[PDB]
Every structure is written in structure tokens, then in C-alpha cells.
Amino acid sequence: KIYPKLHQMDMDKVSRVYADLRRESISTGSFPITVRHLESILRIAESFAKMRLSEFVSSYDLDRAIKVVVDSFVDAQKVSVRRQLRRSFAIY
Amino acid sequence: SLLVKKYCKMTTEEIIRLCNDFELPREVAYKIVDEYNINASRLVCPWQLVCGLVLNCTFIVFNERRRKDPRIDHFIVSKMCSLMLTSKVDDVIECVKLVKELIIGEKWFRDLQIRYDDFRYDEIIFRKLGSMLQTTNILVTDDQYNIWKKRIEMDLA
Amino acid sequence: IKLFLSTDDNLSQTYDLSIISKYLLIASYICSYLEPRYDASIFSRKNPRYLQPSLFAIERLLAIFQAIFPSLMKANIEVFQNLSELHTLKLIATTMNKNIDYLSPKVRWKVNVPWEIIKEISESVHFNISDYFSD
Amino acid sequence: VRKDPITKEWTLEGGALVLADKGVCLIDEFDKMNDQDRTSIHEAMEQQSISISKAGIVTTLQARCSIIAAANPNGGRYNSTLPLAQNVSLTEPILSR
């Protein structure tokens, strides 16, 4: 039944957070941070909305999505991970 | 309020608009462009650093009138308080003070100070060499304090 | 009984040394297994646990230090201060003589602390070390 | 798509990705499969479908279905904090997929 959507409000601020990730990743050297890595965020937030049955994304759900994606990325990386725990921490 | 509306790009065209409405000359305009290029890689919140650096450059590119006429000092913060759509003066003075501290040691600032010959060497020879008779920046320098005093006085009286 | 079962012939210390000293020591321990072949890999900006430690060289210690110090610090007066403190405590002694070490001639430095005090210093400083050793 | 030997008739048979459409395809032991499977799956993931233009047939099956994958790092476990890519024999394209 549910097919949630989004509002304009945070999508450019989450693109802002995406650019911040891009700077934390260029500080990491090589990295696969592409359009896929961003689109994943909303693709997860909409699932979270379905969980909540909202038909439109919510704040806390989008924060959950960004947390999951960013730390799933964090795990993939090298020793920098500890530095990364602070480096890309600006989100949390 | 535009200042509180962070997380916005000020591209080459946008930043050159932000520095052309106030008509800044060639060297300072291109340095604004390049320093926003740099500051994009190292921003935390864009609008604050942007307004701080532009106001701190404008306040010395035209000292031959600011020091000469205290009213244009209020005029600039009034025309950008409205251009940035700010709340009051307090936030803009926070901006200017802090950012000016954050740009007081950058080589571009020394170059802007030395190049135009308007008015630094006396401070570098007492900070690097380390005299006990340099100013500790807990006060405000008599020149900027003269600016503030005179401007707030002619605006009040 | 409470005595018959222990020698008690001893008359892991929380060493007085400080944070910068803790990190100095914990980094100077990193090439008791990590030859300079790998450090620039596992530490870049982008078992010999048993055997006697190999020899460091200065400015490698400073390298790994500046790496794993939690751009934050570049001053090096307290750093070398505590380095000399260490060398007076004979925790990182020099294979070479006792007087010319403080020049930069051929001179090697090596840790003289066993691994348990290393565990202690790591846990107390909350930095983890099990990573950099991999086999 | 094949020809059946007994009846000499062209058929085309839905694959796991096809048999799972509008659902979840669950695969495991990736690093324990041939690279050609890897290539075909990479193709399928990118187009989320399976086109086909083969001997006597032409169409485009749709394979929206998600993929869950249980892997196993090369050799044994996680070596160290070493990068995930180096830690697995899977290609960067399929990793980004």
C-alpha cells in the first residue's frame, strides 16, 4: 500500500551533508563516493517511512538512514576509521 | 534572514556577485574568488566565514574614507545587514571580529596590507621576534576603536 | 595458609609519565614489529612481538607520533622534553653512546619496555593497538 | 534461452533474478563462484532487468528484485582494518552496485 515520498526541505541540506562526505572521502584518498552512494540514502529513508507508514519522509528516519550509510562506509575503510569516527562525524 | 540560511553554494558567479555589488577591485575580487574556492574544501558553515572575510577585506580596501569618514563604517554593515538580511549589528560584529582573527595571519592579508600602501611590519617584527611590547589582543586597537567610537557616536549623536 | 602459597619476594606501574609521553612511548613501540616498509602504508594520510626489538631512527618516531596523535599539534618543545625524560628513564635507550646520542650521527633508538606495560598505557590512554599488529 | 532436444522447440526460462522479480534474490558464497556469473549479475543489477536478443527470440524480461548477498573474505577472516575492497576478491563495479 504505502509509497512514501519526500519534501524539498532537507534534500539540499542532505546534498550539503553529501558534499561534506565528499570532502571527508577525498581526504581518505580513494573512495567510491558516487551518485549511487547518495541515492542510497533516500532509498533507505523511504524504506524507513514505510516502516513508519508515513507516505512522506521524516527527520529522524533520514538521520537513521544517514547514520547507517555513513558508518557502513566507515567500516570499509582503513585505520583512518578511528580518525574517521571524528572526521565525518559532523553528521552525528 | 539569509545568514541563518546556511548550506548554500556561492559559485564563481555567485561569489563574484557578492563581491561586485559592493564593487571590490580586481586583486581583492579575484582573491575573494580564490579564497572561497579554498574555503569550500574547509568550510563548516559557509555564510559566516563568507561575510566575515568580505567585510574584513572591504574595511581595509577603503580605509582612506572609513578612517576619513566614520559614517561609511556604519553604512557598510547597514547595506549588508540588509543584503544578508541579518537580525541586528551584534551578529555581524561577531562575524567580523572572529573571522578577522581567523584571517589576520594569512599571507593574503599581509599582501593586501602591504600592497595598497594605505594602512603589518611593526606587528610581525614584534610577534615573530617576540617583544614584550606588542599588543595582546584582549583590547581593541586604537584605530579600530577610533572607528567604532566615532561611528557609534555620530550614529547616536 | 595465606602465606605458604606465594613467595612475596617482590618488594605494570601507572607510570608518572604524561599524555604526550604516553603517545611518544606507544608510537616508539610500533616498530618492534613494523619495519619502515609498511608504516607509510598502514599509517598514511590517505612473532616479532616476542623477539628483541629492531632499531628505530629519529624522525620516524616523530612521524608516527604526529600520525597517531589525537594537525592538532605541531609544537615540539614538550615533545622532545618528554623524549629526553624517557631516555633518562631508560625506556627507549640508544644502542650508541650516552653523550652524542643527542646529535644526529649514526644513532638508533629502541624501546626497553615489555608488552604488558604497553597494554596498560594503551588502555589508560584509550587508544587501541591491536590493529597495527597483524599476522 | 535454449532448444529442447526431445521436441526441437525454442524456450526461454526465467533465471533466479527473473524468478525473483518484485522480491528478494538471496545469494551467498559470492567469492565461491566463477567470474562470468559475477559479470552477468553485475549486468543484471545495473539494468535491474534482463534484456535478451538470441537465436530466434527477442524480448526484455524485467528483474526489479533486490539482492541480498552473503560473502566471505578472501582466505580467512578480516585481516585487519585493511580496506574492504582489498579484503575481498569482488570487483569494484559490483561493489558499487
Side-chain angles (χ1 to χ4, degrees), chain C residues 68-133:
Chain C
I68 77 167
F69 195 90
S71 166
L72 271 79
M73 63 85 64
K74 269 281 262 170
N76 319 99
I77 182 63
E78 302 322 289
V79 179
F80 301 149
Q81 196 69 38
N82 272 28
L83 276 184
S84 168
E85 275 305 318
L86 267 292
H87 199 327
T88 49
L89 266 56
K90 309 314 289 185
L91 311 186
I92 48 172
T94 181
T95 57
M96 309 327 172
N97 199 13
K98 60 196 74 63
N99 299 318
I100 198 55
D101 180 7
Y102 308 92
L103 168 73
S104 71
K106 165 200 283 182
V107 169
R108 311 304 204 170
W109 292 11
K110 61 185 298 294
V111 294
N112 291 116
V113 303
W115 199 66
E116 283 66 3
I117 187 64
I118 294 298
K119 311 158 55 73
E120 188 276 347
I121 209 61
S122 45
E123 291 171 354
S124 44
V125 78
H126 202 70
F127 157 87
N128 183 1
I129 198 167
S130 201
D131 45 18
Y132 302 156
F133 284 55

Side-chain angles (χ1 to χ4, degrees), chain A residues 2-3 6 20-21 25 29 34-35 40 48-49 55 63-64 69 72 82-84:
Chain A
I2 303 99
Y3 304 100
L6 64 86
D20 302 356
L21 175 65
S25 70
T34 180
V35 298
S40 70
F48 269 83
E55 199 273 332
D63 291 78
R64 282 274 197 75
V69 168
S72 88
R82 45 175 290 269
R83 161 159 62 239
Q84 207 69 26

Side-chain angles (χ1 to χ4, degrees), chain A residues 52-71:
Chain A
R52 203 179 188 182
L53 293 84
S54 165
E55 199 273 332
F56 38 80
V57 300
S58 69
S59 69
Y60 320 91
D61 297 1
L62 177 63
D63 291 78
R64 282 274 197 75
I66 180 58
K67 283 173 189 189
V68 172
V69 168
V70 65
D71 70 355

Side-chain angles (χ1 to χ4, degrees), chain B residues 113-127:
Chain B
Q113 188 57 104
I114 293 290
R115 255 62 165 194
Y116 284 165
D117 294 33
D118 293 294
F119 314 136
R120 201 260 316 174
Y121 199 32
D122 278 344
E123 292 180 43
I124 303 300
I125 60 175
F126 295 163
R127 177 185 311 149

